[PDB]
Amino acid sequence: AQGHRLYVKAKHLSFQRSKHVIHPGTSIVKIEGCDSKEEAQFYLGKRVCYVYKSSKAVRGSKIRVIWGTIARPHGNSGAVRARFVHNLPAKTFGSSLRVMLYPSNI
């Protein structure tokens, strides 16, 4: 059919790292469909979230969300830097993300 999907699919690649030092405060996010740093400027400031599930349920809901915001582009290939309210776990490398269309300026 056709769902809602008012967001854009994205992937968690890695932390902002050098060769041997990592900085989990900033995460590198690949917004799929964005292919250059100029294109990444559209998604700057948008709200990105990591939706996952836990077996224990809270308020009758098993879905937990970590909210973040895209800060700046990273590299020439359209990858961006995102800072989350809680630093994303290291195990979520390659995990999917949702990039909202808000806040909007179009």
Binding site: K9, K11, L13, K30, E32, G33, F93, G94, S95, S96
Partner: protein, 186 residues
Amino acid sequence: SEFQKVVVIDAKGHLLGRLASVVAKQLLGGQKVVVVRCEELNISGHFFRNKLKYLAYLRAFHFRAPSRIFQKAVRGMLPHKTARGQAALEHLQAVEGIPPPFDKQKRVVVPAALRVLRLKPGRKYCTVGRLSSEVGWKYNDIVAKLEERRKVKSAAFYQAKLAKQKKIASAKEASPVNQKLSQFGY
């Protein structure tokens, strides 16, 4: 750009190193990659050059199947000593030929790894399956026999699809709505 939950890649005419690097990067992205026709992988250089390269490796387990040759190249481009690189390997399925489950699925190609778009004209290149035929692999003859059998069935399906497509294509211009509001580029 856009991705898929599972990807089937046709390894006919793809360079071994170029395809393995792209596949290894995609595996670390969480994608599931299935590479078919692993015995038609091409490597730049003379077939003498790769024969001695493999012969030097023969001199651990020396796998002879072309699929396991490609998996070895992909394995070296992953952090296999850690759990992250261990999970990436389990998300890859390299097979020779096209098995039935992936026979009726779309097979994409990687232009960054295609030999025609990456090798100088007239350069000598060797085929992995052909190269592996004289190192211990003894199923090349049968694998080709199934391949022609699959091609005949695949071609018959294409003709059925093409003949069916002619019906909608003919009826596409029959409906006046197409011509009435074709100003949208459709």
